[PDB]
């Protein structure tokens, strides 16, 4: 499933 990068993106990513 989600690797560590996908999890970090799910936690913090914000569209700008």
């Amino acid at each position: 499933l989600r690797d560590k990068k996908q999890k970090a993106y799910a936690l913090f990513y914000r569209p700008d």
Partner: antibody, heavy 126, light 113 residues
């Protein structure tokens, strides 16, 4: 140049409200998460929550049970940690930290706490 | 939901290497990123390791991070121990069910003088 300035120490009593601040200088405050870390005297770090000020999107620790509020005012680039009713247990140092995000050699983003305030010491004694 | 257990204390003489280990109670230590923070006396914490093994600019390479999935642990290794490294070290990871940050209890590193 970039800095986080936290409000000075507070010595209050049980039942008093409180609101401590964390202002960012030298960068776009609204585009980075601000996290709050509690450290009771002589003990370890505890994560209490996060706020993205751009949209004031908030995350909390499961163990706060509504006692505290995490807010922001991006017109003045400030984050806030707020107690409606203080308790003796709330005695601790409270740091705010910026979650930096850059690009790594792979082209993906990474996050970590690069910038810390000096911490607000909150004593709550009768 | 998980815990991160850390030894209370470790010590070593200057110049040699120390390792601080951080065991996760449940789930794989390799399923979520691991950060390590340093906190000297009377100072605010700083990140010495992030994303298991990445070092922020200004942190020397004598600090290194690793993951052992067999033991379900993360490790911080400090080579060429200097007296300025005496401090509390904390491991930290994420719980995705609630997006919570889990911290270890902290380990006091003393440089034997």
């Amino acid at each position: 140049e970039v800095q986080l300035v936290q409000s000075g120490a507070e010595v209050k009593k049980p039942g008093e409200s409180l609101k401590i601040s964390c202002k960012g200088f030298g960068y776009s405050f609204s585009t980075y998460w601000i996290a709050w870390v509690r450290q009771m005297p002589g003990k370890g770090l505890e994560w209490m929550g996060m706020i993205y000020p751009g949209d004031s999107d908030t995350k909390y620790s499961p163990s706060l049970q509504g006692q505290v509020t995490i807010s922001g005012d991006k017109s003045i680039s400030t984050a806030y940690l707020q107690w409606s009713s203080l308790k003796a247990s709330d005695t601790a140092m409270y740091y705010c930290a910026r979650l930096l995000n850059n690009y790594d050699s792979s082209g993906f983003l990474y996050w970590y706490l690069d910038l810390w305030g000096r911490g607000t010491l909150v004593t709550v004694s009768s | 939901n998980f815990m991160l257990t850390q030894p209370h204390s470790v010590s070593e003489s200057p110049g040699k290497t120390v390792t601080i280990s951080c065991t996760r109670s449940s789930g794989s230590i390799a399923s979520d990123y691991v950060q390590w923070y340093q906190q000297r006396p009377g100072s605010s914490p700083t990140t010495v390791i992030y994303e298991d093994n990445q070092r922020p600019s200004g942190v020397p390479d004598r600090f290194s991070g690793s993951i052992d999935s067999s033991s379900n642990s993360a490790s911080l290794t400090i080579s060429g121990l200097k007296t300025e490294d005496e401090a509390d070290y904390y491991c930290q990871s994420y719980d995705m069910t609630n997006h919570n940050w889990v911290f270890g209890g902290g380990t006091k590193l003393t440089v034997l003088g």
